């Protein structure tokens, strides 16, 4: 009946896949995410993890497609935008990455990875003092970073 058990199972499978992807076993993670995608085939987390495993494989072309596909569903996502900006920086273009970083810092201002990436992309521009202050902000933000966001705890009267 309710979709909650299905989402719980999907979250369990996604957490298992994310654990596996941190050790260097792409085949097992791919099998896990393919099994998980059988229930909900067009969620954003499955697309994000497919892009992650594709990037870990060694191909830097499918990852861009998966990240853009994930962005086309939930524009408010942050990790996908950060990964896309990082993968686009080393390509050579310094125009779209700046806009993506600005949008990411506009929607949220509590991720230290966003500040680190902004400083890194600004390092190639010339304004080194702004990069230094961005690095300082990123470091001071990390000192008070929890394992998981505090918003997970429900707020009901």
């Amino acid at each position: 009946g309710p979709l909650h058990p299905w989402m719980t199972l999907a979250q369990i499978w996604l957490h298992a896949a994310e654990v596996y992807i941190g050790i260097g076993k792409p085949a097992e993670a791919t099998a896990c995410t393919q099994e998980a995608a059988n229930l909900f085939p067009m969620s954003h987390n499955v697309l994000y993890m497919r892009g992650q495993i594709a990037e870990l494989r060694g191909s830097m072309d499918e990852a861009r497609r998966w990240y853009e596909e994930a962005l086309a569903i939930s524009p408010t996502h942050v990790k996908s935008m950060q990964r896309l900006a990082l993968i686009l920086h080393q390509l050579g273009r310094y125009s779209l990455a700046e806009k993506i970083l600005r949008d990411a810092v506009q929607v949220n201002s509590t991720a230290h990875e966003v500040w680190n990436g902004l400083g890194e992309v600004l390092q190639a521009q010339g304004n080194d003092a702004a990069a230094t202050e961005c690095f300082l902000t990123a470091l001071e933000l990390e000192a008070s970073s929890p394992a998981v966001p505090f918003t997970i705890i429900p707020r009901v009267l």
Binding site: N116, G119, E120, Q123, D128, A129, A131, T132, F135, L136, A138, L139, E142
Partner: protein, 558 residues
Amino acid sequence: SRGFYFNTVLSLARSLAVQRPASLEKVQKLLCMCPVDFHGIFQLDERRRDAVIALGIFLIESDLQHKDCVVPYLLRLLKGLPKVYWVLPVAESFSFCLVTLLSDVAYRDPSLRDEILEVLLQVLHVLLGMCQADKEYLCKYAIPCLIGISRAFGRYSNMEESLLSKLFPKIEPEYYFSTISSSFSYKEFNIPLEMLRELLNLVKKIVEEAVLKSLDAIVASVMEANLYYTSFSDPLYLTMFKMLRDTLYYMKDLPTSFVKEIHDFVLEQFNTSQGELQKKLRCQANAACVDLMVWAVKDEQGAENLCIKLSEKLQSHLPLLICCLQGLGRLCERFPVVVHSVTPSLRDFLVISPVLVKLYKYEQLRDIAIDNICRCLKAGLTVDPVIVEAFLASLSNRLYILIPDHTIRALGHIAVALRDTKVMEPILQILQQKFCSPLDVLIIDQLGCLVITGNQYIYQEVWNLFQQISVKAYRHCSLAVINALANIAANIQDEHLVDELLMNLLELFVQLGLNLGVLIPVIAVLTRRLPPIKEAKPRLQKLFRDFWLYSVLMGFAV
């Protein structure tokens, strides 16, 4: 895979150093991130170690700006080391890093040399009082820190970038953190003589064996009380001898008293230690002692005695004999008188080596010996212009009387060593008259290296020989000659020779038209090194037209 915190701190340190001058508030911020002293007792964790390492790398690139503030804190840190509380080990690596940074800073500015060496002396006194005098902490941290600081005593580099900067790139470094006593390898700092004398006192005290036995006993007490090291005798012995060789390896302008007392030290250590293992890692220490003792020789008779003592051992541990060969080569280079005396010693071993025979049933020692032979012969021809003629007559006699492979390799190496210098003509005559059996495979391989010398007559001779061989087609050399030609085409630096080779190859290809598909790869390799052609001698145009005519006749382009 350093992580995120370390990587971002290093990136911040790199980005801040390029900004000159650097604002003091950011320096205060990084100092606040760095630890502080509290009642002369220090603790450490990973983050503070990363922060101070970032400070160290920032200091070098910042052109030593605001050193008057950071340096005293570094002095306090290094003097407060023995009482540091802790949460291959990490203490010795950290000591290595900090001492390397200290040596870099000492090299950068000579004004701090005296205070730097005096704090070195004070911490050395503290650790000397520590060793000969609480036990678990001492064994766990004090000894590894001593090993780490000794492993990087004063080695530096007169290079554009810092030695420590090479350790941490801006993406070998992992090699140092996995070995036992590895290290690296004009100013000649105005170091006082009393420092040398007290350093000799340190060395002669720390090489005592009873203190080593007591260390082993307290180590066994620690073992039975319940760790990385097991026995400290060999590692400490090797490390101390290696640092003794390294510290005094390059220093010059010393009166005879210090040299002779150091020579007595090394010779007595040689006699005592070496004359006992005639029943593992001691061979490296013995080799270091041998390398150091040859530098302390200033008499021709002493050089002859050393040559005799080394030669009697040679014609019978691998590093020992390698360093013996290196010292013999260096001594022959230094003194040209003994060139004729040492020539039979090196020649007999090569022309006659049971150890190599057993090894076969590997070549580094062979090429090292050949290079030392070439250095010996160039030193001999430096003073005597007939000794090389005598040596070539002797080599011809030896050739007349699987030694041919070694002989041909030696001939090729000596020909290469004598490219610049009425010396190449006898070698040319010998190679012309030495022709003539699979031994011909490497003969043309050696001949290929001779092409780079850049002589029109030699090029004509070798090209005519190859043309005659090709027209004749020793059928097995068909692949060898084309392989040699392919190797040659990528190692030509004369434009005239390049165009002559192109014309000759075109003429050979058009001549053979009257099996031919294997000649195009060398043409492609040679032609990819030149810009597109616009106009030239019409002979080239006619040759190209004939080449394309034959190509379309045979349908190769299809």
